[PDB]
Structure 1
Amino acid sequence: MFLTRSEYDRGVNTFSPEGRLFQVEYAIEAIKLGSTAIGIQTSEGVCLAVEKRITSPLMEPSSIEKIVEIDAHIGCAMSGLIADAKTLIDKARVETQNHWFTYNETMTVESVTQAVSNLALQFGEEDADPGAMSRPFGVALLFGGVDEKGPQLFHMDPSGTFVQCDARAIGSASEGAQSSLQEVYHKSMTLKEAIKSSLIILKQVMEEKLNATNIELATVQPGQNFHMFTKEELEEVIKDI
């Protein structure tokens, strides 16, 4: 056979040869430009750490809110295109509140990730103005939470798929982090043990050296709600290398 003309992705939602859509796997490793983020899901709770890769000293680090919480017991970690990532976040928040007042309890983490996945996938209605992107989201998401599961972790890829994963790493160095983490992971892990191992692997993976400003982490445990670590907490954690 001879190579000839072919329209490749003229239409969004064009199936590739061997049936494998374009924009979806274009965005999958458009992600790989994203910062490395680590999430560990142990019985004692979950931890969400991520590099902020400060480009220049002229920013104060406080601005880059790489980590937010969908709700008091649902913290979120993101990497890649922050732009529409915040719209993803805002939908997650409004959905959580919708469940909360309509149904007087805390919306469970699994349903949150499932609804967020529902938000994606709406690519091609170029004629229809309402409800559009015509572009897949280009951001990967990590959800931590506590409920009648307690500790939970969900990884989302820009394809509307997710898993009840635990100890799941995403970013530019995602594969190296995942490989090292596999051999590092322990089935029964204490809380700072996850903090410690995850921080060591972060120090090991990222380009720049590691300090308080370089990264941040947050945790939720069955004890109480979302906590975002402050500076002095980061020094008193990284004291021990």
Structure 2
Amino acid sequence: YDRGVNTFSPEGRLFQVEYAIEAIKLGSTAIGIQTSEGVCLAVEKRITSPLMEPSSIEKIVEIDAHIGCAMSGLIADAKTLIDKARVETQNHWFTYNETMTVESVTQAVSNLALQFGEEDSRPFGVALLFGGVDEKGPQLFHMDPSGTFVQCDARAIGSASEGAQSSLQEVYHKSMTLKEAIKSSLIILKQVMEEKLNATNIELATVQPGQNFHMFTKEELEEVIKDI
């Protein structure tokens, strides 16, 4: 029993949604942090093979010229949602000559985060972290499979996200800076990862209002890691 997207519980609830929130927990970790200077973001790849080419695994993809992303858990539901987000932001720029703000992007995604219905398909199994720079400065955003979308100041996802949130609430406050937040994230990273932190494990993605283009750090990330 509970068996099925079309049956409540005697006390609540799904039980399909709950099993999706359960299905989040298996993914790799990621940490995005809002700072008024700009949004930074990090992830762990969990590279298996030396033949596993590291730049081909996507975690941070590019939605807009100033809107980044990160994925979790299931890969291909994320591929679908990334494709649709790209198409629809482009549609907003088409009919409006302007940039669809990040809250409106995520409303456009969570319009069908739950449009799950096989008749009249399954619920999606991915958590997404959205960062971008709207007119209101930088924005950091967190959704879920159930479409219950909320703003977060510094959200951590996936595996080991509890202690990530705890040790994050240890270090975080409102008036942080950029580089301090970068090293504050990667300290938490090499406390929640298992392997030695090096050039190929993690990848950063920072977006600034004056540095809207290139939401990425490429092998100066080596210089950032060796500063710890």
TM-score normalized with structure 1 length: 0.90
CA contact under 8 A between 2:32 and 2:42: conserved in structure 1?
yes
Q: For the residues of structure 1 that align with 2:67 and 2:97, how far apart are their CA atoms?
A: 17
1:119 to 112, 121, 127: 112
Identify if the C-alpha distance between structure 1 residues 231 and 108 changes in structure 2 by more than 3 Å, giving closer, same or farther: closer
Task: Note the C-alpha offset of 1:60.
Answer: 1.5
Change (3 A) 1:56 1:17: farther
Shift of 1:229: 3.3
Give the conservation status (yes or no) of the 8 Å contact 2:31–2:185: yes
Consecutive unaligned residues of structure 1, counting only runs of 5 or more, are 1-7, 129-134
Q: CA deviation at 1:234?
A: 1.1
Assess if the C-alpha contact under 8 Å between 1:213 and 1:231 holds in 2.
Answer: no
How far off its partner does 1:48 sit? Answer: 1.2
**Deviations 1:39-72 (CA, angstroms, capped at 9, x unpaired):** 0001000011000011222212111011112111
Give the secondary structure class of the aligned counterpart of 1:90. Answer: helix
Q: Give the deviation of 1:228 after TM superposition.
A: 4.2
**Secondary structure of 1:168's aligned partner:** strand
- CA 1:226–1:170: 2 relative to 1, 3 Å: farther
Structure number, greater radius of gyration: 1
Residue 225 (1) aligns with residue 212 (2): yes
Misfit runs of 4+, over 4 Å: none
Unaligned segments of structure 2, at least 5 residues: none
> Once superposed, what is the RMSD of the aligned Cα atoms?
1.4
| Deviation (angstroms), 1:18 | 1.1
- Indicate conservation of the 8 Å contact 2:60/2:71, yes or no: yes
The CA deviation at 1:195 is: 0.7
Q: Size of the alignment, in residue pairs?
A: 228
**Distance of aligned partners of 1:152 and 1:228 in 2 relative to their CA distance in 1, 3 Å threshold:** closer
Q: Is the 8 A contact 2:206 2:217 kept in 1?
A: no
Listed one character per residue, the Cα deviations across residues 107-153 of structure 1 (whole Å, up to 9, x for unaligned) are 0000001111112112223369xxxxxx1110100000001111101
Rounded to whole Å, the distance in 2 between the matches of 1:166 and 1:24 is 25
Q: Using a 3 Å threshold, how does the CA distance of structure 1 residues 163 and 22 change in structure 2: closer, same or farther? A: same
Counterpart CA distance in 2 for 1:124 and 1:104 is 34
Q: Aligned partners of 1:65, 1:226: CA distance in 2, in Å? A: 18
Identity %: 100
String of CA shifts for 1:173-212, please: whole Å, max 9, x gaps: 1111010000110211111111110011101111122111
Distance 1:122 1:113 in 2: 14
8 Å Cα contact 1:54-1:214 kept in structure 2: yes
C-alpha contact 1:218 1:226 (8 A) present in aligned 2: no
**Structure 1 residues 170 and 199 mapped into 2: Cα distance closer, same or farther (>3 Å)?**
same
Aligned 8 A contact 1:219 1:226 in 2: no
**How far did 1:80 drift?**
0.5
Take 1:235 and 1:154, find their aligned partners in 2: how far apart are those partners? 27
